[PDB]
Amino acid sequence: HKEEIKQWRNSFLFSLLFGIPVIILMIYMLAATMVLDRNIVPGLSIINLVFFILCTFVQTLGGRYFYVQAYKSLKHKATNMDVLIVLATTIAYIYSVVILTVAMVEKADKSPETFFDTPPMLFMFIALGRWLEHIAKSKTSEALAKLISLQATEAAVVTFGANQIILREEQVAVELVQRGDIVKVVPGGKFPVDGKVIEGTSMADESLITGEPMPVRKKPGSMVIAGSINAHGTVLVEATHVGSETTLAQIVKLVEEAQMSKAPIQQLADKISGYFVPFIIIISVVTLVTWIIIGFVNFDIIIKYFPSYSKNISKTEVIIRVAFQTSITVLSIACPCALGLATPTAVMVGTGVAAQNGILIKGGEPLEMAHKIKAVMFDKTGTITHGVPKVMRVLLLVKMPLKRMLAVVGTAEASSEHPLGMAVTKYCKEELGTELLGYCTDFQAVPGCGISCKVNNIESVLVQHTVLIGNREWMRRNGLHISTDVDEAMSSHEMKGQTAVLVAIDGELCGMIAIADTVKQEAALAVHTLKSMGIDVVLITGDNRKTAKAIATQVGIKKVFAEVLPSHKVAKVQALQSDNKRVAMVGDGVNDSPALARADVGIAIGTGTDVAIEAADIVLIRNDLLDVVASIHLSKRTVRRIRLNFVFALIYNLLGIPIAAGVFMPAGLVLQPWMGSAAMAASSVSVVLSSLQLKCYRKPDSDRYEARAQGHMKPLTPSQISVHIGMD
Numbered sequence: 001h002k003e004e005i006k007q008w009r010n011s012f013l014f015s016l017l018f019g020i021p022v023i024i025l026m027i028y029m030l031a032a033t034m035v036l037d038r039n040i041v042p043g044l045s046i047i048n049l050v051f052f053i054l055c056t057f058v059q060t061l062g063g064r065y066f067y068v069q070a071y072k073s074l075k076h077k078a079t080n081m082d083v084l085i086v087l088a089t090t091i092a093y094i095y096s097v098v099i100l101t102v103a104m105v106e107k108a109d110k111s112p113e114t115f116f117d118t119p120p121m122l123f124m125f126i127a128l129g130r131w132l133e134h135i136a137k138s139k140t141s142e143a144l145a146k147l148i149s150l151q152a153t154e155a156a157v158v159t160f161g162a163n164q165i166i167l168r169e170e171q172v173a174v175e176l177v178q179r180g181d182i183v184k185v186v187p188g189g190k191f192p193v194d195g196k197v198i199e200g201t202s203m204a205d206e207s208l209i210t211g212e213p214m215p216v217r218k219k220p221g222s223m224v225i226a227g228s229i230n231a232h233g234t235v236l237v238e239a240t241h242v243g244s245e246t247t248l249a250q251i252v253k254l255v256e257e258a259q260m261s262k263a264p265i266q267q268l269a270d271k272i273s274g275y276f277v278p279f280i281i282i283i284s285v286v287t288l289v290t291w292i293i294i295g296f297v298n299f300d301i302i303i304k305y306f307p308s309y310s311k312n313i314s315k316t317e318v319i320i321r322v323a324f325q326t327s328i329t330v331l332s333i334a335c336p337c338a339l340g341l342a343t344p345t346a347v348m349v350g351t352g353v354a355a356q357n358g359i360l361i362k363g364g365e366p367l368e369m370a371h372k373i374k375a376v377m378f379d380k381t382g383t384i385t386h387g388v389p390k391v392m393r394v395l396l397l398v399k400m401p402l403k404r405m406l407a408v409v410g411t412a413e414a415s416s417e418h419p420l421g422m423a424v425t426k427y428c429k430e431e432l433g434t435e436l437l438g439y440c441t442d443f444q445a446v447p448g449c450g451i452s453c454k455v456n457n458i459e460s461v462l463v464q465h466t467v468l469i470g471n472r473e474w475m476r477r478n479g480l481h482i483s484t485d486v487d488e489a490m491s492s493h494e495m496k497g498q499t500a501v502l503v504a505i506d507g508e509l510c511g512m513i514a515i516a517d518t519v520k521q522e523a524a525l526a527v528h529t530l531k532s533m534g535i536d537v538v539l540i541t542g543d544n545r546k547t548a549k550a551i552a553t554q555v556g557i558k559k560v561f562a563e564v565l566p567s568h569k570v571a572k573v574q575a576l577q578s579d580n581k582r583v584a585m586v587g588d589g590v591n592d593s594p595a596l597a598r599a600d601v602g603i604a605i606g607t608g609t610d611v612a613i614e615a616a617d618i619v620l621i622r623n624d625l626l627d628v629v630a631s632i633h634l635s636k637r638t639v640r641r642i643r644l645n646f647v648f649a650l651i652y653n654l655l656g657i658p659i660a661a662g663v664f665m666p667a668g669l670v671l672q673p674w675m676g677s678a679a680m681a682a683s684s685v686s687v688v689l690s691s692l693q694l695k696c697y698r699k700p701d702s703d704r705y706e707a708r709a710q711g712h713m714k715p716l717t718p719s720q721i722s723v724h725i726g727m728d
């Protein structure tokens, strides 16, 4: 892609260098120049020779890549802008050279009129437009490198066995590791290869596949996923899949396949030129033939509207030459130069607006593509709901203040590393003055079982004796019975997908605390607005079906897909696309990266993983869900403006075609030399300024979206929503 930009820039610069003198010379000639009209030889004038040299240099240098691209397009059996420019400029230059040569041969008193100015202007403007287009198209795709970065570079190979014979611990590159070997994973170290845990117990973070941050208990006989983050101890892994067979390698393969699947999109300029080229050829040929017929039938019109009859040449020569001149004048006038600037400029401007609005759009494709979206897929964790777990409700199970118990639990749970424990501690701190945690505290934890602590610093809490935190099994083994009402409340909490834990003091049940992810404030409104616009909303997630169903009910999404693996997301996106719907994937995780790449438009939350940002084409820096709606609206406006730009690129030149062909000659209007330049000034500017107008866009207020949905919005019922587990 770099070569295209470099060569287009070189062509544009050469066209500038060898055409700016051409344009300035023609402007000076139009303004008034006797010396310029002076002839070295009767056929050729000084001005004509200068124009010939300059245009020859421009076409030889500026037009080289134009010629190559036109030939390549012809190989594809397609007529595009390059073919139009090459054909028209070559015809004009050949005709100018031929007329100059024949005038020199005939030693005519006055040099003929030449069209040497046309090729330089067309080349300059078209090269500028295509260069801007290629600047816009260029994008950086580092998702593959980010995925490779996840994989562990080195692994700890073990020798002999883990029971009673062990000799050495050595370090081997991950690639050299082979199946059947036993490796060691230290706490906080990456999992090198897929395998089974042997003689080790720990906790592994597996956000690569499932996407959630909740730690996963790993015990002997369990399976580990390469790239998962180990902690809580040292583990030994017996390899089962290595290298490409690893799940991370499969995700990389899916991402690269999705990236390669995307095909180039034909620009509207090429589509317009495809029709224009036959049209321009047809009108030129019609003008030539009709002018020849007019000259032959009467020949009085030719004399009246042209001075070439004064020449000593034969009348047939006069009519043929004037017909050719008029046809080629129509050909020159018809060609639009501003066409290349129609789509690119606006695109860039739109991108800038997005940058001002907190939406980072990479390339021009997302802006041209978002308005066609008919379905949007939302991830659950991070996208629809905050990833961090937060406390929802605390209940009291002799009658001591709730804030005191919360402070006591926070002191007991201060050293807890589990996300739920730290969430409980932060909630307690927020509720309390939280000037400082209790100095005196004794802590003991049995993993997956519960925590027992001794706190004798309740005086510190009051200024601002045993604590036990546990689940059902903790109470059952300790002998504490569970009441029917507390059991029902805990079961209701479990049904909603919110984890509940119980606090007891001095062997007596005291309270219960529930923790769950909180749906974003704008999630419900964004979903409702998307549904109102006619875009289907699908909630696809790898989290447990209960929590996914609860979140969908909260945010009012009818279709729920739970326990979805990364490949299943891509499969769903592919199916939706095959349904002729255009799918936008909103994800902020590694598992979502292949879906984002395959999805027509990938929107990545600003706080998402780096790979998710790289794979996605649109990034929400302001991490606001409603922006997804706004991103659509902007796209709409952009495309509309683009279409309008094309009108400004064509209308003026079209108005010239009737004049160039002599339609208005009886009225007394004939094409003038300045017109050919003037339209180009009128068209190109009329395009660029129009694109600049896109800067006036302002985001609609969220209050407007809520007002449009003030009464239409209504919460869903749990029974209505449907839940699907996996692709099968």
Ligand code: ALF
Residues within 6 Å of the ligand: 210, 211, 212, 379, 380, 381, 382, 383, 540, 541, 542, 543, 587, 588, 589, 590, 591, 592
């Ligand atoms: F946050 Al997910 F699958 F639930 F990427």
Ligand SMILES: [Mg+2]
Residues within 6 Å of the ligand: 211, 379, 380, 381, 382, 383, 587, 588, 589
């Ligand atoms: Mg996520």
